[PDB]
Design a protein around this ligand. Structure first.
Ligand SMILES: Nc1nc2c(ncn2[C@@H]2O[C@H](COP(=O)(O)OP(=O)(O)OP(=O)(O)O)[C@@H](O)[C@H]2O)c(=O)[nH]1
Ligand SMILES: Nc1nc2c(ncn2[C@@H]2O[C@H](COP(=O)(O)OP(=O)(O)O)[C@@H](O)[C@H]2O)c(=O)[nH]1
Ligand SMILES: Nc1nc2c(ncn2[C@@H]2O[C@H](COP(=O)(O)OP(=O)(O)O)[C@@H](O)[C@H]2O)c(=O)[nH]1
Ligand SMILES: [Mg+2]
Lengths: 29, 426, 49, 89, 431, 426
């Protein structure tokens, strides 16, 4: 179908949700 | 970080996961629309385990919904929280299995599965480091047991170094709602034991007795039963989503509860449930939770621990406590019930403490126990299998779609030496 | 038709006509309470949740 | 070959002639005296005894001889707008 | 200081330009009255002392029935009364009728207004041509318009957008004739020519937009969406701007090789858009997917030659960098050995707009792909096969030879297409 | 802008032109008086093609009516729409032809044609850009066939670069209503073929079975038969009078349907007709229209296409309709019935779409097809002509009017060469 063509990897989430490298991404602020 | 992919198959599986995502959304503070509405800030830390965040600040669950008839997804989408699931996770066919294991595994479920693997591969790769899978289904017929076990058998070679949860609904002696129930369950557990990690047995008989005696209800509808087991379903992954003192995920459980690769059947339990008529009367304290959780009437299976011995037990606690009350109490119950625990392994208890209580209660506990008493279900369904198979009944509906006679004998043979291996520890 | 209605009004006295008319029951309004419409009310014990 | 009767004989294709506009706008007489000898079980149990008032229809165009646009809902009766006028408003 | 002139020929040209100019009006806020309710409209909309903005295009067709709907419709007061030229008799699916007999009568009327509009603008880049191969007007009249514009204006660029005849379905019978006899003109008197295929848009609309029964009104919206994404570098600011000259020098290696292919992604409806994240890797993978490609050719069978990427919206150059760096790893996508660097990118700040009653969703970022590849010769071969078995029995010849041309034009047009196919495969052979 | 001069000859032509002008006056909203009574404004933008404007805001058709007996023009004028026909346009003859091709072509019709050319040429120069001429007559009678074929020959030299269309009424085996009609048919077809561009063969046998098994009528009078054929006579030029998506006039149809100058014979058909019993019960959709169009029982010629091969076919649709579905149905009917189409040319189907359906209807279509199977009726009248000619019968009405026997051998030689040319493509 339509949406299954768009696979990709990684995802942004947001600033309160901590993910891998959330420390490195908060640190630049 | 750590992600759990949820699989949802069968009519009972679709009705059990709709209430499962209802409990999580109320726990994490998510409205039916899909936006975060929470009073605290602690609920947004570990939301990546169950939810995939989309643009506009909307969180959708990473669960896939598969069935052969379209009559249950219409009820799910018309449900209270039906709008949060993504519409392209709805994978369904046009013809039902109609209570036939060979229909959902060999002639009809073998076509839809090529799209089901494609959808779950789209979400298993998008995460960062996948922890494991979690499937909810029932053994009542070939719609959710014929292809739910097949999905397990297809994913195992795709992701060998993972962990698979399975909250299966086992048959019961009195709520037998299928004449070919011993056929469809024995043929599934043959294919289920050798390629799974943790399996939980949840039969309707124990849920009926809990609602009628412990909870003192007059009308135990299916909405009430699903909420009981979804409390334990969400109560097993508390340490994954919330901070605590003894953090223990599904794998740290699985190392302790599984001594041998063919001994992975567990007894679910929920401690702090109480009727309204005694809610003010009962003192909510951790000796009362420990005294209640080991009662046979609290067990989520129709097996009595009084006819067996305990191999390994685990308790996961929710809420701000001290830990040595329970450490003394599980030491206490180990000493007094010495004849009910196996003596060739010491320290059969596993302790997990989380700082976040459930909604509406000061504390909670979830009981997971691998016990020797579970063979009584396996003995009961093997004897029903022999009676139906010695007269060659109901075999044209299975042998007419590519199943041979000797495959049933292998299903019986693997059942018999499983319980022959199980018997020797008594 | 009017003369046949006169005939059946006279014939309505009979025990056979009172017990068994064609394709129906007998009159249930003596049995049921006065003023209650039968096809609208619901009979039985409702369940309370 | 075939003996042709009137409409009320159920001979041949009577159904299409009953479907015709004339035999729709023909009136239906009331039940009359000596009518109790002509009641069937279907008439007594699956039918309706309300008198029916006649319905009459205007003059619409016809494009093929079997056309009957009088028995249609008031839709597509006027000339229907082109794609430009529908889409670009 | 910059301007573009659009020429829309044929029934396809006047119908895909209506949805295209509708999106131009919504992007700059132009109501159908012709006024306002930034100087980026000067490339497309002229100025008047009363504040009225008039377009800079010409609409040419021999069918007055479809031109007159612009007169009757909402955009009557906006379009210029003389910029839209009207014929009298259609070419009637004939290349001979539209070129030699009728096309000589209205060429002077069109070229007078082309000269007038070219003198309006101080700086012109070139001409954009919207037409169709299988139409009588779109092939016969265009074959003299390009050969007369090439001598009227020497080095002006010529971009083309052609409605390519489909491999399986079509609305015509002599479409293989009208397609072959116009490629002789367009091979030498054109700079670059994109191809779009009608039933390819049909399957994209069915399996991506989830609309079951599409109509030409939403096909022209997709084609008009592509043209707006192409020219959005000229209209709006960006991190780096790409010109009509820039990609027309980056996509052709040879004068005979000027046939790229168009691709647009993401294409999705309003209901499906809000559930998945549309990152840059999400949208650049669909363009490389052969399923989303809107011309019936498989780049898996062919070999890539050059590519152009056109980014619009909230896009960061770093995640673009990881996107091509991921693509170049894949062996499913194959490149020729003599073009190791076949990527040119373009960045625009403005996200794409949406029309009321449209099918596309409000999307934050989008990418348009203009890829030149060898796989078009697969579509060429299956078309001249249909031409040759038609021509073997001398079908429909008296319709062409009785209007003024001779019979030798069929032989030389097939000979050129045979030599053109020989040039495509020789280029495709590596060392 | 593009005008159509209708020609009307013979008793059959007069009875069929009243109903044809009745449908067009219905289509454009014209009362029997003459004043436009409509509700929309798109019914007046293209009105000059069939109607001449005059004072008082009225419109009259630009049709010429020719016959050799005054007993027919008196009846067409006393019809429901006879007031609107111009009194100038009626041209009379003293003595009728009497079903003789000789009287209307050399002796009696040779004098009348001088006045008819005066009437036509006066009107034909009153427009700005004439699209062409259309004619309707009957081959079975000498009034319309003996003169109308001469009228075709007279106009063809006057206006060479135009399109000539005709709706000929070919004879039939069982509805044979004239003894000498093989003579009046073959002598007309011998001259008809070289001097026309499009020819439709309407036969009364096909109209009688359509009213019997498709529309379910008991008394199909000539008013019903003329109403069926007038639907396609109005349905062929929908794009000239109304806007659409794929406009296609008469010449754009004749380019795609005529590959060789001797291949201009068609078999018409009309799509949406259905009996009044199943009128509102059917779902009127374009796959249903396509399925009704391609059936052999819908054709208005007495030829079975299963015995031949479709060379080229065309379809003109009406009403707003999505073009994905019609393009799928054209591709499907080409792929399934592959044996009924020639293989030396691909894509035998021409598609045209108009956006205005007729009043009270939402979607209609017209089918025009050049088929090899139309040679069956030519051979069927060839064996009847040769059987009559070999006995030297009925010729003293022919050779006694200034005629030789050579145009009888020449007519048979040309038409035998015509059917020999049709033989090769099958
Ligand atoms: N995608 C798309 N294609 C169109 C559209 N309109 C026409 N076409 C194409 O045009 C082809 C037919 O030629 P037309 O453009 O309609 O007519 P024409 O160019 O005036 O040529 P003539 O028929 O000889 O007058 C069809 O096969 C379509 O593919 C449109 O709105 N969108
Ligand atoms: N607890 C619970 N059990 C359910 C629910 N719905 C169905 N079931 C159980 O599912 C069993 C029947 O399984 P079935 O639907 O035939 O399996 P399937 O055909 O593979 O989908 C019954 O014994 C029910 O007890 C529910 O909402 N809650
Ligand atoms: N379908 C149809 N056929 C007609 C009509 N009027 C006459 N005919 C046919 O025309 C034939 C007679 O033609 P005729 O009047 O002698 O032609 P004419 O001598 O040229 O006027 C008959 O066999 C009829 O079947 C009509 O209104 N509809
Ligand atoms: Mg045209």
């Amino acid at each position: 179908k339509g949406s299954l063509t768009l696979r990709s990897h990684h995802k942004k989430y947001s600033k309160p949700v901590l993910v891998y490298s959330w420390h490195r991404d908060r640190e630049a602020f | 970080m750590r992600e759990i992919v949820h699989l949802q198959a069968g009519q009972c599986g679709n009705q059990i996961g709709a209430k499962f995502w209802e409990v999580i959304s109320d726990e994490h503070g998510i409205d039916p629309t899909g936006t975060y509405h929470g009073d605290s800030d602690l609920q947004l830390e570990r939301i990546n385990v169950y939810y995939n965040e989309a643009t506009g600040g909307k969180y959708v669950p990473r669960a896939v919904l598969v069935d052969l008839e379209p009559g249950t997804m219409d009820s799910v989408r018309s449900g209270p929280f039906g709008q949060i699931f993504r519409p392209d996770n709805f994978v369904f066919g046009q013809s039902g299995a109609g209570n036939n294991w060979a229909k959902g595994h060999y002639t009809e479920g073998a076509e839809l599965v090529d799209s089901v693997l494609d959808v779950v591969r789209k979400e298993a790769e998008s995460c960062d480091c996948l922890q494991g899978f979690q499937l909810t289904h029932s053994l009542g017929g070939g719609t959710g047991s014929g292809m739910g076990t097949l999905l397990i058998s297809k994913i195992r070679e795709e992701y060998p170094d993972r962990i698979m949860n399975t909250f299966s609904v086992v048959p019961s002696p009195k709520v037998s709602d299928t004449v070919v129930e011993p056929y469809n369950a024995t043929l599934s557990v043959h294919q289920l034991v050798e390629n799974t990690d943790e399996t939980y047995c949840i039969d309707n008989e124990a849920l009926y007795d809990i609602c009628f005696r412990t909870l003192k209800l007059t009308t135990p509808t299916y909405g009430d039963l699903n909420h009981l087991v979804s409390a334990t379903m969400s109560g097993v992954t508390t340490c994954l989503r919330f901070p605590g003192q003894l953090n223990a995920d599904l794998r740290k459980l699985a190392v302790n509860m599984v001594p041998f690769p063919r001994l992975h059947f567990f007894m679910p339990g929920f401690a702090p449930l109480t009727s309204r008529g005694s809610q003010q009367y009962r003192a909510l304290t951790v000796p009362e939770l420990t005294q209640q959780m080991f009662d046979a009437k609290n067990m989520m299976a129709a097996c009595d621990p009084r006819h067996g011995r305990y191999l390994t037990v685990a308790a996961v606690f929710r809420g701000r406590m001290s830990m040595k009350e329970v450490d003394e109490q599980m030491l206490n119950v180990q000493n007094k019930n010495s004849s009910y625990f196996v003596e060739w392994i010491p320290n059969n208890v596993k302790t997990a403490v989380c700082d976040i209580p459930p909604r509406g209660l000061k504390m909670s506990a979830t009981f997971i126990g691998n016990s020797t008493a579970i063979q009584e279900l396996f003995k009961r369904i093997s004897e029903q299998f022999t009676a139906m198979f010695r007269r060659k009944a109901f075999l044209h509906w299975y042998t007419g779609e590519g199943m041979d006679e000797m495959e049933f004998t292998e299903a019986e043979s693997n059942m018999n030496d499983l319980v022959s291996e199980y018997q020797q520890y008594q | 038709t009017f003369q046949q209605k006169i005939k059946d009004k006279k014939e309505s006295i009979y025990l056979s006509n009172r017990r068994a008319p064609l394709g129906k029951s007998h009159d249930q309004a003596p049995g049921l309470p006065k003023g209650m419409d039968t096809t609208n009310t619901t009979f039985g014990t409702a369940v309370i949740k | 070959n075939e003996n042709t009767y009137s409409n009320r004989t159920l001979m041949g294709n009577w159904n299409q002639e009953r479907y015709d506009l004339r035999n729709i706008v023909q009136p239906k007489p009331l039940p009359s005296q000596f009518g109790h000898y002509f009641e069937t079980t279907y008439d007594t149990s699956y039918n309706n005894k309300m008198p029916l008032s006649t319905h009459r229809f205007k003059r619409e165009p016809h494009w093929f001889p079997g056309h009957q646009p009088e028995l249609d809902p008031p839709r597509y009766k006027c000339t229907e707008k082109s794609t430009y006028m529908n889409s670009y408003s | 200081m910059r301007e573009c002139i659009s020429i829309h020929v044929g029934q396809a040209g006047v119908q895909i330009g209506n949805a295209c100019w509708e999106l131009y009006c919504l992007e700059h806020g132009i109501q159908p009255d012709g006024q306002m309710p930034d100087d980026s409209f000067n490339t497309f909309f002229s100025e008047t002392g009363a504040g009225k903005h008039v377009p800079r295009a010409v609409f040419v067709d021999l069918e007055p029935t479809v031109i007159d709907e612009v007169r009757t419709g909402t955009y009557r007061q906006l379009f210029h009364p003389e910029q839209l030229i009207t014929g009298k008799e259609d070419a009637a699916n004939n290349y001979a009728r539209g070129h030699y007999t009728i096309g000589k009568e209205i060429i002077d009327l069109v070229l007078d207004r082309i000269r007038k509009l070219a003198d309006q603008c101080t700086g012109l880049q070139g001409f954009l041509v919207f037409h169709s191969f299988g139409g009588g007007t779109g092939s016969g009249f265009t074959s003299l318009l390009m050969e007369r514009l090439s001598v009227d204006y020497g080095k002006k660029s010529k971009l083309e957008f052609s409605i390519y005849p489909a491999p399986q379905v079509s609305t015509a019978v002599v479409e293989p004739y009208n397609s072959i006899l116009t490629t002789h003109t367009t091979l030498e008197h054109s700079d670059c020519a994109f191809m779009v295929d009608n039933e390819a848009i049909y399957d994209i609309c069915r399996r991506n937009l989830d609309i079951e029964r599409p109509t030409y009104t939403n096909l022209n919206r997709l084609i008009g969406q592509i043209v707006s994404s192409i020219t959005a570098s000229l209209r709006f600011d960006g991190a780096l701007n790409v010109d009509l000259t820039e990609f027309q020098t980056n996509l052709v290696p040879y004068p005979r090789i000027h046939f790229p292919l168009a691709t647009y992604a993401p294409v999705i409806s309003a209901e499906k858009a809000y559930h998945e994240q549309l990152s840059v890797a999400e949208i650049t993978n669909a363009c490389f997917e052969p399923a989303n490609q809107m011309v019936k050719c498989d780049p898996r069978h062919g070999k890539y030659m050059a590519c152009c990427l056109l980014y619009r919206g909230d896009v960061v150059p770093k995640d673009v960098n990881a996107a091509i760096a991921t693509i170049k790893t894949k062996r499913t996508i194959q490149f020729v050995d003599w073009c190791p660097t076949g990527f040119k990118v373009g960045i625009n700040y403005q996200p794409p707009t949406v029309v009321p009653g449209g099918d596309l969703a409000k999307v934050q970022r989008a990418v348009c792909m203009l890829s030149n590849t060898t796989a078009i010769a697969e579509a060429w071969a299956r078309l001249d096969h249909k031409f040759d078995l038609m021509y073997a029995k001398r079908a429909f010849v008296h319709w062409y030879v009785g209007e003024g041309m001779e019979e030798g034009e069929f032989s030389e047009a097939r000979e050129d297409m045979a030599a053109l196919e020989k040039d495509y495969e020789e280029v495709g052979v590596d060392s």
